[PDB]
Design an enzyme around this catalytic site. Structure first.
Site, PDB file in Angstrom:
ATOM      1  N   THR A 188      -2.350   7.682   2.080  1.00  0.00           N
ATOM      2  CA  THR A 188      -0.878   7.849   1.984  1.00  0.00           C
ATOM      3  C   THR A 188      -0.613   6.447   1.714  1.00  0.00           C
ATOM      4  O   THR A 188      -0.727   5.535   2.217  1.00  0.00           O
ATOM      5  CB  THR A 188      -0.170   8.449   3.244  1.00  0.00           C
ATOM      6  OG1 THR A 188       1.320   8.107   3.014  1.00  0.00           O
ATOM      7  CG2 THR A 188      -0.789   7.913   4.600  1.00  0.00           C
ATOM      8  N   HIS A 241     -11.075  10.460  17.013  1.00  0.00           N
ATOM      9  CA  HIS A 241     -12.390  10.161  17.803  1.00  0.00           C
ATOM     10  C   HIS A 241     -13.117  11.118  18.411  1.00  0.00           C
ATOM     11  O   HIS A 241     -14.215  11.065  18.704  1.00  0.00           O
ATOM     12  CB  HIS A 241     -11.623   9.363  19.465  1.00  0.00           C
ATOM     13  CG  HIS A 241     -12.634   8.245  19.630  1.00  0.00           C
ATOM     14  ND1 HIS A 241     -13.898   8.443  19.760  1.00  0.00           N
ATOM     15  CD2 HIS A 241     -12.512   6.897  19.969  1.00  0.00           C
ATOM     16  CE1 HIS A 241     -14.398   7.135  20.089  1.00  0.00           C
ATOM     17  NE2 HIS A 241     -13.488   6.315  20.401  1.00  0.00           N
TER      18      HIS A 241
END
Lengths: 239, 240, 241
Positions: free
Chosen positions: B154, B210
């Site tokens: 992005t 994570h």
């Protein structure tokens, strides 16, 4: 405190509950822009004596940040807004009710400057003095803490460059004002680059992706940045 | 004006509000930030832009360089081009690099996909970006243009940002933001001597999940990207 | 074997890490405050005293014992940060022990072994404990006590190049400090009211903190104590040479 277990007060209990919940009923992310505050610093240094003499209050950086943020909330009504995830409706607030984070011995509070869009820099400076004083001396009324449509928090007051402040729904944004620091930066004039010392600040904006996307956040922060960097505030000081 | 009204949002905004709130609750997002010296890419782009447009028929921007480096790193770090199943505790490592790119439309932001981006050259990437940006603005994207993404880029610097903590959408494990490229005074070292020079610097914030990627994995992936861009050995890749 | 084009069950460390990190964010209110610290004086002190330090104490002198010493002193002087919140009873527990977890790399993944009662340790004792824990983590010689009781964590996110990150905090801990990469930068120096540009070793210290326990001002005061301790760099006596 060390080696003890103690029950927290009502303000701290509410803060713990509301911040945990806030992150689960919104989609928070923090966009960061850097702003050159040198021209505001020079304007403030030049006009501070006449400002205090005429309006009776000190001229800090906060009314400049507030004026720019409130003008940008009027120009970007999509940011001064709330989303209802059940009905899928967006409400665009006509009032800019600006909450400000204030330090109190019992905990941080966020008193509100209602209809901040109608206020001049002298009026903003007086409202900040009033809210900070009553917050520290326990003279706030319930109306002083409700109706907020956006928040500003001075994270730079304890030395931070930046943070990812937690917004509290129904608000869609919370802007942090980082520490203002002298830095060597690049200046370009007639295609020639040079290095100069400038007062730089980071403005982290936490926004709710239900209401504001990355491009919307960037356009809102660009309006704030350009207003502060141009620093055309002499007329706004009403000297 | 919008002020003083309550309005139902369009379908893109409705889905975006729903997916971003949910995405943060079905992943463990955090954003690691590295700084990259883009000066050599800027000089290479300025030098070869006329020959690139003449041969390939498309403008040469920074985006194909970021795409080429990110896609090479996704191939070299297959653990990042992956998805986690929290019920079976299994990781799926995708052989295709299907690169989603954030694009602006009148109706809102979309993330069309460059499928099998690992097979593409810089000229092919530049042409694919032109095609996707055109069809996104002219409402000619098809369902196959929006599905199968394995990673996203992005360009948060397009509206002035240095950095952000972009929201990743599962089953993807990472989303890379390209901050604004800014001239900065930096320290350079030549023959053991330190000096101050003006360089074009960019921040690359990577939001990663994570569940799939830890801090060290993220750092090694961003180091591969940073070293590729800072070395800027892309002249042969431009196919002039 | 090769990961690409396969589906494979993750190992025990990755499985627990995936569950704990997703859940941690939903049972706390995490945010990351960032400060910059001038490490030049620590770098010069470390370069000057490194040979005498390894000769006397037998272990290498890295930046980590300096960060640990400063953080542990700040956890003692800011007991509100070395604390845990019980959201059911609305009670805060202020821990008397500073049990410092440190992120360590292993072949099987990242672990966070703990230096128990770190408030009683000198820089040489911290340096010896780091070497021991890193070695036993990588060679599977950790005992359960080495992984429990943590009250705060330090993670060296700069070891793989990062300037900063928003590290995930694991409740009941209230803070996790990342040490970003230490980088030479041109900065402004002020001497006798005169500003000048100088090259200094700068580091970002992102602190992820739980807003149930610590507010933005509390985080700032805690990081200022750490920053001032490191920038003053009065550690020669602490090295016990």
């Amino acid at each position: 405190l060390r080696g003890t277990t103690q029950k927290v007060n009502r303000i701290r209990e509410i803060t713990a509950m509301k911040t945990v919940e806030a992150l689960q009923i919104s989609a928070q992310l923090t966009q960061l822009h850097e702003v050159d505050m040198t021209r505001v610093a020079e304007l403030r240094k030049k006009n501070k004596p006449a400002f205090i003499e005429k309006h009776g209050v000190n001229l800090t950086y906060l009314p400049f940040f507030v004026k720019a943020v409130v003008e940008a909330l009027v120009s970007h009504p999509n940011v001064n807004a709330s989303f209802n995830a059940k009905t899928k409706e967006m409400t665009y607030h006509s009032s800019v009710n600006l909450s400000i984070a204030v330090d109190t011995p019992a905990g941080l509070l966020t008193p509100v400057i209602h209809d901040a869009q109608d206020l001049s820099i002298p009026e903003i400076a007086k409202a900040i003095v009033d809210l900070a004083d009553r917050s520290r001396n326990n003279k706030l009324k319930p109306n002083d803490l409700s109706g907020g449509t956006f928040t500003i928090t001075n994270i730079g007051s304890e030395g931070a460059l930046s943070d990812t402040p937690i917004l509290v729904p129904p608000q869609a944004g919370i802007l942090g004002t980082g520490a203002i620091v002298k830095r060597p930066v690049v200046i370009t004039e007639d295609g020639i680059d040079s290095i100069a010392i400038r007062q730089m600040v980071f403005l982290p904006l936490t926004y709710d992706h239900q209401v504001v996307d990355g491009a919307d956040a960037g356009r809102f922060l660009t309006t704030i940045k350009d207003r502060l960097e141009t620093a055309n505030f002499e007329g706004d000081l009403q000297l």
